[PDB]
Design a protein around this motif. Structure first.
Motif: not given
Lengths: 328, 135, 259, 140, 267, 371
Positions: B39-45, E182-186, E191-197
């Protein structure tokens, strides 16, 4: 991607350990059925192999005895003695050699001096047991000879050289379980890595139907399609990819919005507070005439409303009645 | 068979139970890292892609939608109430004198309302004087 | 006497022909009156329309003046709820504006400039000058009674103060009961003055047209009756002319004494 | 046999390292290479992620917004007269604002004052209260 | 992790579970007198190999505590090369190391006694020893990793957090954990990008609203058609009517402005 | 001796023609004027019967008198309108409101007869003007009058309009004043000097005093409160003259009670002087429950005056409906129809033939006179 390499890598994972299995797992079975049934086969076997086999077919046993050469130095006489007694090793001295080797190997005679007594009789079936005996130390040579002889040490004197000292001979079997545990200990992390990347393999099969099939689409047709799915959008979309035109796109929006914000945005800051007049929409419709005079009445002059209505009808009717009669 | 089962039971701690102890500090990371990084690698890209996307996203959302969303949501408001009290009243310029005189009055009607309350005091005075008459 | 009856016959030739011949002309007269009957009725057409016109002419005095007034009077109760918002708005064009800016703040200026001189300059000099006379008066209460000294401690005071104590109590206590009484007169006093004055402007001129009340309709009623007598006058000249015809027959009285 | 002298495996640990070797050394030495390989598949995977974001949106947004473009054009059809007024954009801009400004300042005035009558009334009354001081002149 | 091993190991000791507070400090005390007084049940089997001096301990019962003190250096000659340096360490907190050395000999005696009893059944056992194991367990073992694949979802539920960091933090997670924070903050944005579909459904709604507002403007926009051409000529006189609001008050105040405008000049 | 009867007959038939003229005295005077001159000119009486129509043409030249007549005819009634008050104001005020039960029947027979009797009495200035026209009018005046009946009924208007100011201006005075005072009397000149604003000036001069005594009037009871403070201030006043007050200080054995002995002036001095302002409002407080009703009654009397006004206008509509019956009186000529039916019924044909022989017998006696 890359299971075939990974499976080839997985084959290499098994290759290291199972290379021994080619000779210690695959070869033994055919000679294992050739050992228990050795007595049926040693008859014709002992007429050509003792010359040919020792030089060619059973010279391979000298290859494994090579690492054990130190101890095998005494055992080295056995291929030496067998070569010079080919007519006599076919059926006779296969039991006598143990007695001959016992005299030269007193530390190991403990097996050999015991071996020479019982080997003479059933030799044509007992030779099979003797064969295991010189194979009983081959891999054990890595472990048995030096380490077990290192018993007289102060750290292991009282505990081992008193009660476990009698286990000098039986300790040979203790080696065989250690490698089994060693492999399992070698598999303490090996299986865990084998547990999931093998599992992940079927997730790399999913990226076939989902991901890599799409990149195959990406490579040729979508890449050309990128030439197509963006040429039209430059009118509305592709301009902003460089930020210089992104404002220009906003400027085209500003070209489109030049009239909108000029008119719409003027009331934007005041429409939020215009909801109050929306409350006045109903009030100015019907409550406008009621609250004009009742602003002082409904607040504090509530009791003063009734006398005004009383004079409005009881006494003012007669004058308007004359007009009402005209208005009738 | 009990001896067979116990003899088999000493083999897993080399293999099974050891990794729940040793690889629980040395091998379990494979389950931990891979799933989240998946999940992290996908979102970071996507973040950089979102950085690639924002310039268009700042255009469609704000510059296109939110700009025009603000515009549209008030053209109905101005055509309903705003155009009523100046644009229509031009045709009613005979009434605009009276129509604009009324808001002046609602700020001054209570000034003239003293007359009606100056009559109710007679009723109030009689009510107040009732106690003195009883006394 | 030879020629006493000769001259008249010559002139009487055509003259005597028409004497009784007018009895034939009896038929000629009613053509003339019927000719006038058309003449009379046609001129009545001048008066035929005028009777409604004069009534219509007074009907001009019907709606324009009298009932532009009572329409406001009539429609008073019909919309009295909105009348308190619509009519007053027009009514409060100046009278309420004058009250808001002038009458509401008329009295404030003179409160502080007139109260002080009219309330703190009335009893000061009398109070200032009474201390000396009291000193002279108290000597008489003592020197003319001297034997009272042993009984002069307290109760000797009441001999002249008794008639003043309770009466002073009543005159001071009435200050409290009049606290909310006079605070309302000022606002009501001025409003009644302007209300009476404004509506008396109505009254004073309305007390003059009562002299002219006997003029609006009295003259007009006689105007319609001024021409009713004309119809009454028609029946006057009818009996006489017809009287000639019946008496034309009586000429046979002495004629029957001939045949 | 070395289990009895497993205290001597401290020296034989180097020899015991071969017991690691044929089964476990090949295990990690190859799995270390696998770390490169799982990076390599990630390199292929990471390349796809950028492309799909480009290609899909550029085409998924493509067909849809064209349909929505007509409505925007139809929205411009709703401004057809003002589109004719675009050539007169200097003059027509003022008129509709004047339609607003004469009403878009009373709306904040009407809403704000009735909600702020408790406090804003005094500030508004300050300018008006001075001209009601004329009551001194009417008698004087 | 090895620190807790001390707490658990004599927890199983039915008579030594409570002394755990002092046990790492009085384990040598346990090995001094409890070694026979209390360790006669489990470790006594290991004490069988130590019987000679224990038999000698019968002769020196008067000074057995003194003599066991003499045996302390014989505990040291047990570690005369392996554990001379850790000897100071193992007394308090590295007691797991000598337990790593206690289990060092524990697995041997089991192997030792197994070797002794297997030395009597070896009439054919070796004929079945070096051969059978390679084909049964190993064939399953490669397939048994799949068995671990299922259970590595069950037991690591409370261990996945426990075992993510330990080793990779020095090489891999050193920057990944900061990236992980940093990732969990973003993560909320993604998550909304899943809703972006599904975002096209409200994205198309925006342009529908003005179209819906255009539909409401039917018979109003058509008047707005007139409201431009018919009325644009009328705003030009309307700016003169803009002065009427101020002029409206001036109306009744026109007569009285002469006595009012001088006030502004005074101020 | 009947020959004399025939002899006198010749004379009497000459005298009989001298009696036919006395059939109509309106014709007797006209006939004898031409009869004596000539007998064939006496036949012009038949033509003079046509002169009446020609006499109507003479009335056209008399129209110069007609216009000058109607003017003073209105001068005949306008001056006597003072007497016209009781006869017509009562007549107009009670036609419908009082006689409606019998108005349709009593008006054209009884009520109108009285007005004519009043017309006989007070408008006697005009009955002669039509009584002299009762015989010479229709032959002469009716041609021009009916030609000018609309002219004399519209030329009459612009003096009634001046005297219709009672009602025409009433609405103006009632209406066009209230709207006028909002913007015209609002800017009335300072200190008005006219009757219309005199009552306002009464307020002004009355305002000239009320404002000066405004606060004191609302605080007449509070006037003694400051006087009460003056009693407290008397302590300072007493201390001011302490250099004289030492005489009482010597009488320590007498100082105890004299302080309240002075209390009479400490209480009565301010009490008596405070009875003036209190009396200014006490006289009205005791009757405030009745005087306030009088104050509002003035406003009600304005509405009471409104009631009187709307009474007349509504009562004005009442006479117009009766005035419709007055128009119906112009349609009520059905009453006089039988008086004209006898005129048409007497037009017989048969006596005409009988007199033919009669004059034939009578005229024959004239030729025998030559004897």
């Amino acid at each position: 991607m890359t299971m075939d390499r990974e499976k080839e890598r997985e084959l290499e994972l098994e290759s290291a350990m199972y290379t021994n299995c080619l000779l210690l797992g695959l070869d033994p079975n055919v000679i294992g059925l050739g050992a228990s049934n050795g007595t049926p086969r040693v008859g014709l076997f002992r007429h050509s192999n003792p010359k040919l086999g020792e030089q060619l077919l059973y010279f391979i046993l000298s290859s494994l005895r090579g690492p054990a050469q130190s101890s095998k130095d005494f055992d080295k006489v056995w291929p030496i003695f067998d070569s010079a007694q080919s007519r006599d090793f076919r059926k006779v001295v296969q039991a006598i050699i143990s007695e001959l080797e016992s005299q030269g190997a007193l530390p190991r005679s403990n097996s050999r001096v015991s071996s020479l007594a019982t080997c003479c009789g059933p030799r044509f079936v007992e030779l099979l047991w003797q064969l295991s005996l010189h194979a009983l130390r081959e891999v054990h040579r890595r472990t048995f000879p030096a380490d077990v002889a290192s018993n007289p040490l102060p750290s292991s004197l009282t505990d081992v050289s008193f009660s476990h000292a009698a286990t000098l001979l039986p300790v040979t079997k203790a080696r065989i379980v250690l490698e089994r545990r060693r492999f399992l200990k070698n598999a303490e992390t090996a299986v865990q890595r084998q547990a999931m990347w093998s599992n992940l393999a079927h997730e790399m099969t999913a990226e076939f139907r989902g991901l890599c099939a799409e990149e195959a689409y990406l490579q040729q047709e979508l890449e050309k399609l990128n030439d197509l799915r963006n040429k039209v959008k430059q009118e509305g979309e592709v301009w902003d990819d460089l930020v210089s035109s992104s404002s220009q796109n906003s400027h085209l929006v500003s070209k489109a919005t030049r009239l909108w914000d000029s008119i719409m945005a003027r009331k934007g800051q005041h429409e939020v507070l215009a909801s109050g007049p929306i409350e006045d929409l109903i009030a100015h419709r019907e409550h406008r005439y009621r609250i004009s005079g009742s602003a002082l009445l409904a607040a504090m002059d509530q009791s003063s409303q009734v006398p005004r209505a009383e004079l409005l009808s009881a006494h003012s009717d007669d004058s308007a009645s004359l007009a009402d009669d005209k208005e009738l | 068979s009990i001896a067979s089962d116990l003899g088999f039971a000493v083999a897993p701690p080399p293999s099974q139970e050891e990794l729940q102890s040793f690889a629980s500090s040395n091998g379990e990371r494979g389950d931990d890292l891979i799933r989240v990084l998946r999940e992290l690698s996908v979102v970071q890209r996507k973040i950089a892609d979102l950085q690639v996307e924002l310039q268009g996203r700042k255009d469609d959302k704000n510059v296109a939608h939110l700009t025009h969303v603000g515009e549209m949501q008030k053209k109905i408001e101005t055509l309903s109430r705003i155009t009523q009290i100046l644009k229509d009243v031009i045709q009613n310029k005979d009434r605009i004198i009276a129509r604009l005189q009324q808001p002046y009055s609602l700020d001054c009607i209570p000034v003239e309302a003293e007359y009606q309350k100056q009559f109710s005091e007679l009723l109030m005075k009689a009510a107040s004087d009732y106690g003195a008459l009883t006394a | 006497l030879s020629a006493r009856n000769l001259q008249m016959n010559g002139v009487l030739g055509r003259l005597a022909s028409t004497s009784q011949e007018l009895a034939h002309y009896h038929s000629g007269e009613e053509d003339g009156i019927y000719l006038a009957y058309s003449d009379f009725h046609a001129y009545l057409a001048g008066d035929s329309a005028c009777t409604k016109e004069l009534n219509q002419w007074f009907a001009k005095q019907l709606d324009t003046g009298p009932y532009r007034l009572v329409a406001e009077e009539g429609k008073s109760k019909c919309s009295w709820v909105s009348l308190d918002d619509t009519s007053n708005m027009l009514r409060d064009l100046e009278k309420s504006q004058h009250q808001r800016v002038a009458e509401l703040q008329r009295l404030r200026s003179i409160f502080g400039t007139s109260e002080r001189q009219w309330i703190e300059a009335q009893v000061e000099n009398a109070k200032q000058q009474a201390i000396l006379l009291t000193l002279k008066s108290q000597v008489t209460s003592v020197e003319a009674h001297i034997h009272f000294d042993l009984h002069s401690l307290r109760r000797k005071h009441a001999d002249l103060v008794e008639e003043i104590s309770t009466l002073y109590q009543k005159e001071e206590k009435l200050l409290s009961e009049t606290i909310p009484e006079l605070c309302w007169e000022l606002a009501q006093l001025q409003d009644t003055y302007i209300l009476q004055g404004d509506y008396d402007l109505k009254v004073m001129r309305q007390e003059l047209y009562i002299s002219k009340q006997k003029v609006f309709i009295n003259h007009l009623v006689n105007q319609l009756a001024r021409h009713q007598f004309l119809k009454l006058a028609c029946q006057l000249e009818k009996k006489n002319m017809l009287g000639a015809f019946s008496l034309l027959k009586v000429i046979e009285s002495e004629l029957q004494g001939y045949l | 046999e070395d289990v009895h002298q497993l205290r001597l495996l401290h020296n034989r640990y180097l020899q015991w390292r071969f017991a690691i070797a044929r089964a476990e050394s090949v295990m990690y030495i190859q799995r270390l290479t696998s770390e490169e390989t799982l990076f390599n598949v990630w390199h292929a995977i990471s390349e796809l992620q950028d492309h799909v974001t480009r290609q899909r949106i550029g085409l998924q947004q493509l067909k849809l917004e064209i349909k929505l473009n007509s409505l925007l054009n139809d929205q411009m059809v709703s401004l057809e007269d003002w589109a004719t007024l675009e050539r007169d954009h200097v003059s027509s801009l003022v008129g509709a604002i004047s339609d607003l400004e004469a009403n878009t300042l009373r709306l904040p005035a009407t809403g704000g004052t009735k909600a702020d009558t408790e406090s804003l009334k005094a500030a508004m009354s300050s300018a008006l209260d001075v001209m009601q001081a004329m009551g001194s002149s009417i008698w004087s | 992790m090895a620190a807790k091993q001390m707490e658990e190991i004599q927890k199983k000791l039915r008579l030594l579970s409570y002394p755990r507070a002092n046990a790492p400090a009085q384990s040598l005390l346990f090995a001094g007198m409890e070694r026979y007084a209390l360790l006669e049940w489990l470790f006594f089997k290991l004490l069988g190999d130590k019987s000679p001096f224990s038999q000698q301990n019968l002769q020196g019962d008067a000074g057995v505590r003194d003599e066991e003190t003499v045996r302390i250096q014989y505990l040291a000659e047990i570690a005369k090369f392996l554990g001379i340096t850790p000897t100071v360490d193992i007394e308090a907190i590295q007691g797991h190391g000598t337990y790593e050395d206690r289990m060092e000999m524990l697995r041997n005696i089991v192997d030792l006694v197994e070797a002794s009893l297997f030395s009597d059944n070896q009439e054919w056992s070796i004929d079945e020893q070096v051969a059978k194991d390679i084909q049964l367990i190993d064939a399953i073992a490669e397939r048994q990793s799949l068995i671990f694949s299922e259970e590595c979802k069950l037991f690591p539920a409370d261990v996945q957090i426990q075992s993510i960091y330990p080793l990779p933090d020095v090489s891999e997670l050193e920057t990944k954990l900061s990236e992980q924070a940093k990732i969990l903050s973003n993560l909320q944005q993604k998550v909304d990008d899943l809703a972006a579909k599904h975002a096209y459904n409200p994205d198309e709604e925006y342009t529908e609203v003005e179209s819906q507002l255009r539909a409401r403007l039917e018979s109003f926009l058509e008047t707005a058609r007139a409201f431009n051409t018919i009325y644009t000529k009328e705003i030009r006189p309307w700016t003169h009517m803009m002065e009427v609001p101020q002029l409206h008050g001036f109306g009744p105040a026109a007569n009285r402005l002469l006595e009012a405008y001088n006030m502004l000049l005074k101020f | 001796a009947y020959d004399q009867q025939c002899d006198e007959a010749t004379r009497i038939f000459a005298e009989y023609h001298k009696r036919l003229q006395v059939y109509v005295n309106q014709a007797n005077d006209a006939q004898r004027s031409v009869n004596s001159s000539n007998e064939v000119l006496s036949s012009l009486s038949a033509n003079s019967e046509r002169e009446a129509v020609y006499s109507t043409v003479k009335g056209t030249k008399s129209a110069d008198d007609v216009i000058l007549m109607e003017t003073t005819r209105e001068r005949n009634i306008r001056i006597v309108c003072d007497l016209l008050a009781s006869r017509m104001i009562e007549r107009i005020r009670n036609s419908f409101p009082a006689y409606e039960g019998n108005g349709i029947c009593s008006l054209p027979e009884l009520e109108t007869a009285k007005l004519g009797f009043e017309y006989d009495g007070e408008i006697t200035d005009e009955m002669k003007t039509v009584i002299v026209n009762s015989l010479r009018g229709p032959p002469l005046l009716l041609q021009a009058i009916a030609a000018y009946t609309l002219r004399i009924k519209t030329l009459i208007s612009r003096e009634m309009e001046k005297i219709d100011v009672r009602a025409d201006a009433e609405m103006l005075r009632y209406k066009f004043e209230n709207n006028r005072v909002t913007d015209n009397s609002s800017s009335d000149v300072s200190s008005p000097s006219n009757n219309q604003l005199l009552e306002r000036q009464k307020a002004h001069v009355q305002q000239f005093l009320a404002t000066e005594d405004a606060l004191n009037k609302a605080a007449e009871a509070r006037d003694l409160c400051h006087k009460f403070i003056n009693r407290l201030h008397g302590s300072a006043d007493t201390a001011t003259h302490s250099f004289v007050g030492g005489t009482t200080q010597s009488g320590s054995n007498l100082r105890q009670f004299e302080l309240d002995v002075w209390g009479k002036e400490r209480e009565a001095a301010g009490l008596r002087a405070s009875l003036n302002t209190l009396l200014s409002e006490i006289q009205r407080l005791n009757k405030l429950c009745a005087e306030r009703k009088e104050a509002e009654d003035s406003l009600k009397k304005k509405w009471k005056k409104i009631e009187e006004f709307d009474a007349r206008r509504s009562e004005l509509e009442t006479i117009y409906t009766t005035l419709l019956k007055a128009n119906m009186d112009a349609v009520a000529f059905w009453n006089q129809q039988p008086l004209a039916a006898r005129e048409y019924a007497s037009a017989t044909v048969i006596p005409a033939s009988e007199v033919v022989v009669d004059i034939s017998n009578s005229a024959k006696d004239f030729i025998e006179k030559e004897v």
